[model samples]
Target: AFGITTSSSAYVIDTNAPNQLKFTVSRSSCDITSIIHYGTELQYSSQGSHIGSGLGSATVTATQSGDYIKVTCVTDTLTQYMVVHNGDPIIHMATYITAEPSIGELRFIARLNSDLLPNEEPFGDVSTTADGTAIEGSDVFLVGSETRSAFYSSERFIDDQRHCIAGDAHRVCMILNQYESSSGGPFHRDINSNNGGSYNALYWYMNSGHVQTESYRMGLHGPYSMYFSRSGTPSTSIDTSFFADLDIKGYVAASGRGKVAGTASGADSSMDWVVHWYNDAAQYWTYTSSSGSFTSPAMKPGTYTMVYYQGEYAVATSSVTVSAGSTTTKNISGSVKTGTTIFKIGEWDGQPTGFRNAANQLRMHPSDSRMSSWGPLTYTVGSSALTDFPMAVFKSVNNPVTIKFTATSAQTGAATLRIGTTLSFAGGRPQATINSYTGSAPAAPTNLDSRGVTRGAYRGLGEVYDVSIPSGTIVAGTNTITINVISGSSGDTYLSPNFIFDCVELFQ
Candidate 1:
């Protein structure tokens, strides 16, 4: 008799039967009226959604005194081993992170449910739009109702949410963060070296209300991280699993910022704030009313600090937890300055390049028709007051430079401004004129066009410039580059802070 024996030798069946044996009640027969079986009856369905099913032979074995058997359930068509039995059965699993992520990278997991796999659901529910205000009510639900993650209950989840089988966990769990250690403090910020700062972390809102429950996660960096050594292509199984008639859903990052494309140059159009994922060790970031956004990858994430940059640099983060085999959501958001404009002086807008004009205040005279020779225009390099002018002088061992300012009068008697490295002078006076006589200078100088360059009119908002140091510029405590403005039209002036600051890099 085959009883429950604890000590026994394993037996091998060498028969050429099919891989599995499942007993089913005949469709023509009624329940129990014909036979007396203790377990519920199962009806066999040989039609598969994609892979056709054909009646095949199976091996017969008995465990739990049942009338069926199970072996390696392999289908040659799909080349996949079936995990669950034909009938409903709960599963328990243990997970092992065989390949871990390196410093500043992520390890992610996903699960596919029935009805969504085998090309039934192309995109499944895994998407950025899946978060916040994208969908509503039960209409936003994904597959596997019994296992629907609360993480997706609201609009969405922020970090590491997953679509997973109820019992299999490690396969659906994800780990995100830089493997290295980073400090999150009052003044410190997330490092921006990863591909234009794309690896920086950020947060997104799942619900339009900006509630915590509606947050989802996303990586600003990449499916393949650039900062970490182990970073590479993300598993394509996330897509395949969805194609296999599996209900697939996961978290997405919404309203967060990415480093590289956070704010583009040339226009304020890129000033919009974003949320992204930073792979750094810092845990969290708090976006202040001053800074535009926040990112938190660590428990003690990077801080939000605005030193000097276009839009405040954002932090990428991941910090949330949920039940196994399910998705969870988290979020972080704060205020940022919108439509803020920063102006800089042009190449040599306000420097005194040459000779005599004893008066520091700009003076105009008939002799000032030519460039100045007696007094060399001077400009202060590091001071915060230099951002307002149009031009700045740069000199090198090979490229010795001198800057001058000149003005010309227009047909309408409008004043036109000019900044250049060449100097001009006449008689006993030094002239570095600012503008020609024209209608008027704008409240702010426009460097966008040639017409803007000739807009004429000094002191209307003045001009702006950006200077770069490749080999680095001369740095004494402070050196002076002088400028003199000869006005063709007398009554014009640029505003205060009219000059901004620093030619040398700020962070460096």
Candidate 2:
């Protein structure tokens, strides 16, 4: 009463001795009482036989339901290692046996599932006999019968056959030696000059098409490559080789506030930049969109050159070195403009004795008589009035037409503005000079003194003035402007008439 069914499990039987087989079976769960060879009974057993022998030194050992059944059989026989019970098949199963050329070495397994067999034909031609037996050299075949079967090698090779197809039924399939035929298996454009020998290769066809092996040899596609490693147990080993991985990152300098050109932080993704990577093998090109970030395919270890392009223009370039089994990082950046277009004259440092803006305000003179630094532009007799004072020079590429500044004085006198012998301001204005005057004193102008007093407590407030230069007065390059104090005498307790140079501003 063995409860055998289609789902019953199977076991492997290994025979280690020549012509001797041993099989172990579960005493309470199995009813196998006999073993057969061909059509003849080889051995008989009791209800629970653990070991037995068949014809010509064959032995069988049955252990338990899960343990192996060891069988040793005579050499040179291709069939008849069958087990039965109570005069019928105990389970619908198939037994497959493979042999080793070494003495006392063989193995077999019983597949308990009947559905694990070949029941259908392959896609290509699989020649078979009229009774459905596959013919030798058919390239495909099935073995065993109704209960179970599988695709097996035909054991015979057809002479000069170009293509072959074989597989275990209803399982895996494979194609081999595809480009190794006489005429390259119907694809036409064939070459029999492969590296390993006369192996066929597929090339281009048709009169309108062009094919060149130089494109392949020159790596127009990319750098072709691989990598490797090894693995194993005691005395057993395996070596493997494959492709390596690579990644890259960086930023593009975009135009905006607080941004610097030619650096990573100043970079932006407003436009895409072309990237070209080259090594000893070949060159490859890629692009990064607005993000200014990029990634690369697997590359080999060596020195490489990387170039970044803005449109057709090459903007930046750098070099990188890659090491084996590691990732290489190479970041690139572009250039931008600076915002230092306007200059403040008061911010200038350490002026000459009478020319520096000591109080650190727009005025060139000190607020009080402490006079730790140059006080102001004073008008005295002969040698007192300054003729050639310090001036400020700036480069204006766009050619500004106007100059602005604040003019102030505590004394009742005025200074003059000069632009390279062209236009001059008359001394009547608070900061303008007297006309056609040499070293002689000019009558002081009113309201030219901010406090309207010629005394010690005078409060000199600066007044802003805008002056327009004559056409072609200011050149497109570096321009220099100077102030000349007019000759005058003392009118107050401060002794000398003084004018304050406040500041100068320029406009494009």
Candidate 3:
């Protein structure tokens, strides 16, 4: 049984189930002011859950449609919905923002009482009193050499579906972030939770300055869920089909969106492929099957630039228009590079996975004790495994990496060297030294306002620098190319100027 009680000050909902949800919204401002789950009040002492403090002076209404109860709240700048499905233990929410006047942090924060809902997740609490020795900035702390930060427990949008935290008797989670309205593509990351002693802040980060790449998109962001459970930290399989009929403001129904499907030709069978469709309105990405077949999810109706990526390189680009409720079938031609190369160390994709100290960069700090020593040593290609090549180059920590390769008589000539990076810190870029033929240093990466590598992040603004190696520079037997970091601004240690390597290729 379910009942809704409304008064002058609040709207309260009681789902009289085995694991019940007692939710309340302030009638004055449309803020989630109270949440009592399983006979325990889980809301923070001061605030509960809201969009940037509160929706301040809004219209709140509740209506019952088939199998669902929808509470729609509207302000001058935003519209939001709180929903409940028949008897399921959930408080589903959807947010729509057009032009919010106050730009604090674009997040839907669920402020739960940390003392009662202590996070059992791996993230270290920056607000914990036991934390010792501040690490990078004011945020990261170390408990006797163990790094701790709220920022550490984050994931790229591609990797995140449900972010949850558990307690002794209960668990609370934010399920399924529909990021169609999120900017900066898939690689951008943001704060997930700021677990403090007083309260735990679980976030649905729509947009923020954490590795920001673009302006926020204005549209329906989510019909996401606030799921509570007695099962301790179990992965959930939630169906959101009930949302389609809820009439959420700004939501696009299945009939109003379209898809793209095709088999890509001329692709590397061993490597993965990504198909990206983008416009100023929205962006989307998806992986292809091993056979190079793919189908994009239903997307907004608009013209978009579709790109085919072989690993990380954009091999093909074209345009297509998506219409309402139709599958747009267009065969993607990879058009990958067919030219000869003397040596290509790694895949041309926009990541540093195969390189040394890569792969796990997203989980651990660069200078973590578990990591191998970042070196000032020489590397010989073919003799050294690709893992021996450090994924990143730092101006102070590990500058001037020496790469040695043997060139036969037939292989000696003018060459083009391609060096790419997924991201940089402190204005870092690469300068190449090819067999004593040094070229002028390239300009710093365009976006250097934030720290990446040291803070457990690598996906930032990416750049590729192509350098020309003159004919005389190629020696017959032994060849050496030393790569150095070039930048004006600087920092110390792992936070010093650095760029994570994408790949290094020498073309004949």
Tens digit of per-residue lDDT, candidate 1, span 1-508: 2122221222121111122222221112101011101222111122211111221322212222132122221222111111112221211011111121222222211112222111111112222112223122322222222111122111112212222211111111121222112122211211110000111111111112111111122222111111100112223222211112211111122222122112212212233333333333222223222343333332222323222122323222333432222322344433322221121132221222121221211212111223133212333333323322222121111011223222122111211122222111110011222222122222323221111101111111213222221222223223222233322222112110112111211111
As for candidate 3, its clashing pairs are 312-349
Would you give me the overall lDDT of model 1? 0.21
Clashes of each: 124, 32, 1
Winning candidate number (TM-score): 3
Measured with C-alpha atoms, the lDDT of residue 96 in candidate 1 is 15
Give residue 141's error in model 2 in angstroms. Answer: 59
TM match of model 3 to true structure: 0.91
Q: In terms of lDDT, which candidate is strongest?
A: 3
lDDT of 3 by residue, 263-363 (tens): 87776666778787878778787888888889987899999888887766677888988998898998788664625788887787777888887865665
Task: Give the CA lDDT, 0 to 100, for residue 271 in model 2.
Answer: 37
Worst window of 10 by summed lDDT in candidate 1: 191-200
Q: Candidate 3: lDDT of 254?
A: 76
245-271: candidate 2 lDDT, tens digit per residue: 111011111111011112222232443
